């Protein structure tokens, strides 16, 4: 729970720079714009089919209130 | 040569059983990375053990120059009789180069980092923290041990 002891760690090693002699942004762009679509590709499928049947019927749902509103023409004598 | 590499394959196992060379050896490597400063004295195992005879031929025919070593006495010893025998053995020592490949000396950057060798099941922990030195020609050294002074040292065992 305390910082001192959480877990049992062996033989790993971590290597950090200072955040004052590395760059901010590196690659913000080059490396940055691959990334990005590369977890649009992997997550694209599971999350766009189902707002897509939301705008589906979305319309359907405006065009069928519409066309109660409009008349019909089984009126005439 | 096989003898002491076998040798020195043993030491570098004893002192990287040993705890704090392992942490000077990883703070000068953090410290002065990318440079000849962050590598070991030792050095790697793989150099030692790929390393042949015709390289250190090599190293003792480059860095064993003559104006690069400093006869020292200290005692009960005569400098007349030191230069005489000086002049009498070490008069040829070749100081000039192979095929003038003379070496220099080049600066070594300093960077701020970490190194963090995380194993729990040892029962000590051992850090050191340290920043960019002023050199040996630079006269900030005295004032900089004096404040080391001030800092000063602490063992368990101490009395004080
Ligand atoms: C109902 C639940 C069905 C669950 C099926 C399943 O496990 O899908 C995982 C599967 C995992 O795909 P993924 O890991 O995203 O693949 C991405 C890879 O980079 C690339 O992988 P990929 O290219 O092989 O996937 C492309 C995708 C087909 O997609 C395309 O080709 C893209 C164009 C759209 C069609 O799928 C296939 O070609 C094979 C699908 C086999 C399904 C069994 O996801 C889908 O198939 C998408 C969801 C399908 C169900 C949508 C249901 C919506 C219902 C209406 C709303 C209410
Ligand atoms: C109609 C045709 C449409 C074509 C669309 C092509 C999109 C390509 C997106 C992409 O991945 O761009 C990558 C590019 C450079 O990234 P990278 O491939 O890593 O290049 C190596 C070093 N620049 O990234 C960039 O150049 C970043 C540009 C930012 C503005």
């Known amino acids: 729970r305390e910082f001192g002891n959480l877990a049992r760690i062996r033989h790993v090693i971590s290597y950090s720079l200072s955040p004052f002699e590395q760059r901010a942004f590196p690659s913000y762009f080059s490396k940055g714009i691959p990334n990005v679509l590369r977890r649009t590709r992997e997550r694209i499928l599971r999350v766009a089919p189902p707002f897509v049947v939301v705008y589906l019927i979305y319309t359907w749902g405006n065009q069928e209130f519409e066309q109660s509103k409009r008349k019909n023409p089984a009126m005439y004598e | 040569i096989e003898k002491e590499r076998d040798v020195i394959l043993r030491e570098m196992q004893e002192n990287d059983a040993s705890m704090q060379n392992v942490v000077f050896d990883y703070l000068h490597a953090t410290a002065f990375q990318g440079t000849p400063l962050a590598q070991a ?113 602490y063992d368990c065992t101490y009395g004080g």
């Open chain 2, 41 to 153: 004295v030792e050095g790697p195992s793989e150099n030692v053990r790929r390393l042949s005879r015709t390289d250190l031929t090599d190293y003792l025919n480059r860095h064993y120059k003559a104006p690069r070593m400093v006869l020292a006495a200290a005692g009960g010893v005569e400098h007349q009789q030191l230069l005489d025998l000086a002049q009498k053995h070490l008069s040829s020592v070749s100081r000039v180069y192979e095929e003038d490949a003379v070496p220099g000396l080049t600066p070594c950057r300093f960077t701020g980092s970490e190194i963090r060798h995380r194993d729990d099941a040892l029962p000590l922990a051992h850090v050191a923290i340290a920043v960019e030195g002023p050199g040996w020609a630079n006269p900030d050294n005295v004032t900089l041990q004096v404040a080391n002074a001030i800092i000063g040292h």
